[PDB]
Write a protein that binds this DNA or RNA. Structure first.
Ligand SMILES: *OP(=O)(O)OC[C@H]1O[C@@H](n2cnc3c(N)ncnc32)[C@H](O)[C@@H]1O
Length: 646
DNA sequence: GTCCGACCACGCATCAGC
DNA sequence: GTCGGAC
């Protein structure tokens, strides 16, 4: 029928009757755009999941081969994360394509996008570039997804202009609300309120209600008909856990969907299983606000405390044939990034180890003084085509978990077992491969000292993980089974800074209409200057951000004050009269390549910025001259234990 | 608690304009 | 990475 009247949120949805395309025919992108419209219209995740599940139900029964692109479009993903596909399209490039497609000037389009905080609204309500053009053939979901991959594949010189032509071709073919969601997808801000967890929930519910592998018309279109309310809830929850645990071990829709469409959800765990060479989703941590909050949530359950090393996570896979692969926490292939780790793998395990998967942290290590180097030194390593002899920043590994060992997966094993197998089958080599500094006890006085020792030993804090009660590696049960105890989480850390607001930035998405970010500055007394130190975008409540936008709008200046120095920082949208002083908390102080704050007091050509800055409260009693000085900022950077360790 | 999406610094890798 | 909001 007509995809313009598609309603996937209809009460009592028939996957075949309520669809807007014939069987065997490509799924129209308008059907996807209409589904995105009903999803964004609501705020309850349970209602959003059922709406997406209705689209997926119509897809599996009518056009199975279009299920993969529809899922990728709903996730705003280009493919499996280990393939490293990236659009390579910035906001300015997308805005240039919008202005050219709609026939408007670039400045008019850029002003509307900034004032509306969304490029999708600007790209949709502009049907002037059509001029005298008959409507192009309607967009399909698989065709739109194929164009996205085409844009991501374009590289080399003059590739930006070729990306614009493809984006322009999509816009002139967009009808109704299609332009809003393609521009949102290209900008990386789909803004649906639904993401990976809800897509997985909608997928398992769709294949459970409407099973795949059926002949059309489908004999079974709603497998929850003769079921009670509690019986259907527990059935769908049990089905959603089968898919989630499989995806947690194999986060690859290119591997899961074809197996899902041929054998069903119940046969999935026997075809897709955690194997070396295939990256898996890592165990995440929950921020804890103190020791006492660690004793809660865990309750009467024994746990271990380990050093939280400040580096990069390295998921190292050893295949049965001998090949070695390393993956980031985003399942990105980092094998070519660590040629040293590959050549060192012989010295970390004993001969009777054939295959494994370790969960380690690659930390920048120095062999000259035998000390841990900060995270900024680690990020100076090359990313690809690294020659082993050209490595200038050595790396020491800190293993803390074992997922695979000699052909068997230890995902369903307690940490006590996985840790015990780690120390038995692996040898420690200082400066290269060492076990995470651990400690198993309950004494609060002992734990508090371990937190101080970790910071003294160049670490962010402590990681708290149970040993036997809910101590498995099953992400699908709880993604954040571990706890992180960082010092800067406490109430009396001391690393608070009183900074002056010198600029504001127009907000986007949730922050559209008001300010999304602010420019902060410290006072340099000798130069009589306000030197920008960092930007601030988190820590405000929604009510506080409304008060800030109202009160700071009276201080808006057309030009910056002569004593304000920002150097290389992003020029604020609204220059502000220096008056507001805010207390700001951070985790560390970093040597900045753009920020001029305290430049010349610790480094000759580099200033200081803030690591993980967040807003705390307004300092009404303070004035811009009473704010933190650049001398205090330089003294704070020198007092950092990692800086003192050199 | 869960899930989602606002926002932060930094530096390698990449590309347009010249 | 931190953070707050809707459920
Ligand atoms: O703050 P965050 O979510 O990045 O912390 C989690 C990450 O911290 C790293 N890390 C460092 N030390 C450990 C130990 N001992 N155990 C687990 N993770 C650890 C990891 O990279 C982790 O993803």
């Amino acid at each position: 029928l007509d995809p313009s009247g598609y309603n996937p949120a209809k009460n009592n949805y028939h996957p075949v009757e309520d669809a807007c395309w014939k069987p065997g025919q490509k799924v129209p992108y308008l059907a996807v755009a209409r589904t995105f419209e009903k999803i964004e219209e609501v705020s309850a995740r349970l209602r959003m999941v059922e709406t997406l599940s209705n689209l997926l139900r119509s897809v599996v029964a009518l056009s199975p081969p279009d299920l993969l692109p529809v899922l990728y479009l709903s996730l705003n993903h280009l493919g499996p994360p280990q393939q490293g596909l990236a659009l390579g399209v910035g906001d300015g490039v997308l805005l240039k394509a919008v202005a050219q497609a709609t026939g408007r000037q670039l400045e008019s389009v850029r002003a509307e996008a900034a004032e509306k905080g969304d490029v999708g609204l600007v790209a949709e309500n502009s049907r002037s570039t059509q001029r005298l053009m008959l409507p192009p053939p309607p967009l399909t979901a698989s065709g739109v997804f194929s164009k996205f991959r085409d844009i991501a594949r374009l590289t080399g010189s003059a590739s930006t202009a070729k990306k614009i032509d493809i984006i322009k071709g999509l816009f002139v073919a967009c009808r109704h609300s299609e332009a809003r969601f393609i521009a949102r997808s290209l900008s990386g801000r789909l803004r649906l309120g639904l993401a990976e967890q809800s897509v997985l929930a909608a997928l398992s519910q769709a294949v459970s209600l409407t099973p795949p592998g059926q002949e059309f018309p489908p004999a079974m279109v709603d497998a929850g008909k003769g079921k009670t309310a509690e019986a259907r809830k527990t059935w769908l929850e049990e089905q959603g856990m089968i898919l989630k645990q499989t995806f947690c071990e194999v986060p690859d829709l290119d591997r899961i969907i074809p197996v899902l469409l041929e054998h069903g959800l119940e046969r999935l765990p026997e075809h897709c299983k955690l194997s070396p060479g295939i990256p898996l989703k890592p165990m995440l941590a929950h921020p804890t606000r103190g020791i006492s909050e660690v004793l809660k949530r865990f309750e009467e359950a024994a746990f271990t405390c380990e050093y939280k090393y400040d580096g990069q996570r390295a998921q190292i896979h050893a295949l049965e044939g001998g090949e070695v692969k390393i993956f980031s926490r985003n399942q990105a292939d980092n094998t070519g990034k660590y040629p040293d780790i590959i050549s060192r793998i012989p010295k970390i395990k004993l001969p009777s180890v054939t295959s494994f998967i370790l969960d380690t942290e690659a930390v920048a290590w120095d062999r000259e003084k035998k000390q841990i180097q900060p995270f900024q030194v680690l990020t100076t390593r090359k990313r690809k085509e690294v020659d082993a002899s050209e490595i200038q920043v050595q790396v020491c590994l800190y293993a803390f978990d074992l997922i695979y060992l000699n052909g068997e997966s230890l995902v369903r094993e307690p940490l006590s077992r996985r840790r015990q197998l780690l120390r038995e089958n692996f040898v420690e080599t200082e400066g290269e491969f060492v076990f995470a500094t651990s400690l198993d006890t309950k004494d609060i006085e002992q734990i508090a000292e371990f937190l101080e020792q970790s910071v003294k030993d160049s670490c962010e804090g402590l990681m708290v993980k149970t040993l036997d009660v809910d101590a498995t590696y099953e992400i699908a049960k709880r993604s954040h089974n571990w706890l992180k105890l960082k010092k800067d989480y406490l109430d009396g850390v001391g690393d608070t800074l009183d900074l002056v607001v010198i600029g504001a930035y127009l907000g986007r998405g949730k922050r559209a209409g008001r300010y999304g970010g602010f420019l902060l500055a410290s006072y340099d007394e000798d130069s009589e200057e306000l030197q920008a130190i960092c930007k601030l975008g988190t820590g405000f409540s929604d009510e506080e951000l409304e008060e800030h936008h109202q009160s700071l709008k009276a201080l808006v200046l057309p030009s910056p004050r002569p004593y304000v120095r920002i150097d290389g920082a992003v020029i604020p949208d609204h220059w502000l009269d220096p008056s507001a002083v805010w207390e700001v908390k951070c985790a560390d102080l970093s040597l900045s390549p753009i920020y001029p704050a305290a430049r010349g007091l610790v480094d000759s050509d580099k200033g200081i910025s803030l690591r993980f800055p967040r807003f705390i409260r307004v300092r009404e009693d303070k004035q811009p001259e009473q704010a933190t000085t650049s001398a205090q900022v330089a003294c704070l950077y020198r007092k950092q234990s990692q800086i003192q360790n050199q």
